[PDB]
Structure 1
Amino acid sequence: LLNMRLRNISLKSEHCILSSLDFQTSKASEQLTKKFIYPQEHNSFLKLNFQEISYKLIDGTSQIELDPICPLKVPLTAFSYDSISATFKLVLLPKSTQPHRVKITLAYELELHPNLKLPVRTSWETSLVNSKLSNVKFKFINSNIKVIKGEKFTMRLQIINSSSSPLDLVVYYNNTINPITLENQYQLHNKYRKIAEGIILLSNDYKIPYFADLRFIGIMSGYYGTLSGLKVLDLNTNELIEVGNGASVLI
């Protein structure tokens, strides 16, 4: 009851799990000792944090937070350090320790020493594109990695089949503006114009019969997230499924 602490954990699925604890000043405790401090002629507190440490709770383990920290001391404030976890596959809720050491202060003496440790479980918990018919999974072998400079480049759509008639389908890009609150008309028009006119796909109806190369050229700039347009089409009626994947800044 001097410094309220909370830990927030965010699940970055393309990397490690990120969890950050957060100290604060706990105002419902500060006016308490503010009353006696301004009784003794002091305006704000001088609590000194001298040893702050998060340890990985286990039989025994410890971690290290993902940037640098000094030995600090603040009056009415909040600080928050971040430490990276390891992104679990399924069903193992890890736990942490989070010890701390607040050192209070008085007139060049009487440093009433305090310490605190709140151990709890660090599990807040709130690119394969499947075919959705017969598990013909597609993945780009270098997705989201392309700094092109309006030059040619090549990608790799590694199709993974049932190995049962593995020669079936054809890619294409569809350079055509799709035909679609008036600025909601205009934002959709600018999105559909920059999608259907910015890159070209130099191997158009490539008719793949399990890698591909798919050379593009890319004649306008801007971050093309999710790279729409690049559809495939298969032996059945309409397997017009997307890739929905891969991105390229073009500057």
Structure 2
Amino acid sequence: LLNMRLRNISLKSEHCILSSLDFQTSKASEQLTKKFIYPQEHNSFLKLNFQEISYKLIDGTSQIELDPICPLKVPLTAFSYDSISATFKLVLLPKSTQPHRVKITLAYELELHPNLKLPVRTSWETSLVNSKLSNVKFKFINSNIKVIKGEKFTMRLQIINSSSSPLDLVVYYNNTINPITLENQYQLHNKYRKIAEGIILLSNDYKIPYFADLRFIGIMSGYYGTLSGLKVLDLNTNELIEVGNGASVLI
């Protein structure tokens, strides 16, 4: 009851859940010690946090922070430190423990000594393109973020199919404007315009035959996150697989 603490956990896409703990001197404790300190004419407190650490599991391992941290001391403040946990594909929820050491130094070198230790579970409170029909999956083997200029470049698809008939699909980019509140109308027009002529495929209408190298050239500068022009058509039972993957900046 001197510094209220909370922990926030987020799930990054790079298979590393990041959990950040936040500490803040609570206002009720602030006024509680503040009137008794201002009786002796003190305006700013001094809670010296000298040893803050987090532990892992039933065997205690000290996972470090993401940056440096000295031994600080301040009043009426808040500070947050972020550790990087490991992403779990199973349903084993990791339970961690944190500990601090607040030295509540009253003045003229007459200090008290306080320590605290919480322990809880680091929950989070709740791409590979796959089709809807068959076993056919898509994933770009080369890193989906890429930094290019407006020059010629290459990109690499990959197909994991049912081995019964691996062939009979075609790719094409469809360089035409999709046929569409004037402000939202023109915003959707600018999205559909810079999609339809931003990059151009240097081999479209292209029969596939488990790799498939397909080669572009990029014209217009900008970050094309989930570049969604190119559209792999499946010949038999005529449907379309969108490929919402890959993101190329062109600067």
TM-score (normalised: structure 2)? 0.97
Q: When you count strand as a share of all residues, which structure comes out higher?
A: 2
Residue 5 of structure 1: aligned partner? 5
Task: Mark the CA change 1:238 to 1:108 in structure 2 (over 3 Å): closer, same or farther.
Answer: farther
Task: Give distance in 2, aligned partners of 1:233 and 1:21.
Answer: 48
Greater CA deviation, 237-246 or 186-195?
A: 237-246
Q: CA deviation at 1:242?
A: 0.7
Q: CA deviation at 1:27?
A: 0.6
Q: CA deviation at 1:229?
A: 1.1
Q: CA deviation at 1:213?
A: 1.6
Q: Which runs of structure 2 are paired with 1:118-197 in the superposition (5 Å)? A: 118-197=118-197
Aligned partners of 1:3 and 1:24 also within 8 Å: yes
Aligned partners of 1:136 and 1:161 also within 8 Å: yes
Residue 28 of structure 1: aligned partner? 28
Once superposed, which parts of structure 1, at least 4 consecutive aligned residues long, lie more than 4 Å away?
Answer: none
Q: CA deviation at 1:215?
A: 1.0
Task: Give distance in 2, aligned partners of 1:88 and 1:10.
Answer: 13
Aligned partners of 2:170 and 2:235 also within 8 Å: no
Task: Mark the CA change 1:126 to 1:44 in structure 2 (over 3 Å): closer, same or farther.
Answer: farther
Residue 216 of structure 1: aligned partner? 216
Task: Give distance in 1, aligned partners of 2:126 and 2:173.
Answer: 36
Q: CA deviation at 1:199?
A: 0.6
Aligned partners of 1:232 and 1:239 also within 8 Å: no
Deviations 1:171-230 (A, max 9, x none): 000000001121110110000000000111101111102212211111000000001111
**Number of residues of Structure 1 aligned to a counterpart in Structure 2:** 251
Percentage of matched positions with identical amino acids: 100
Q: CA deviation at 1:166?
A: 0.7
Q: Specify every segment of 5 or more residues in structure 2 that has no aligned partner in the other structure, as ranges.
A: none
Aligned partners of 1:143 and 1:245 also within 8 Å: no
SS in 1 for 2:176: coil
Task: Give distance in 2, aligned partners of 1:106 and 1:233.
Answer: 74
CA RMSD of aligned residues (A): 1.0
Task: Give distance in 2, aligned partners of 1:143 and 1:185.
Answer: 34
Task: Give distance in 1, aligned partners of 2:238 and 2:69.
Answer: 57
SS in 1 for 2:197: coil
Aligned partners of 1:54 and 1:65 also within 8 Å: no
Deviations 1:137-170 (A, max 9, x none): 0000124221110011111110110111111100
Aligned partners of 1:233 and 1:240 also within 8 Å: yes
Q: Specify every segment of 5 or more residues in structure 1 that has no aligned partner in the other structure, as ranges.
A: none
Q: CA deviation at 1:236?
A: 2.3
Aligned partners of 2:168 and 2:236 also within 8 Å: no
Task: Give distance in 2, aligned partners of 1:61 and 1:125.
Answer: 25
Task: Give distance in 2, aligned partners of 1:91 and 1:62.
Answer: 23
Task: Give distance in 1, aligned partners of 2:222 and 2:86.
Answer: 33
SS in 2 for 1:237: coil
SS in 1 for 2:159: strand
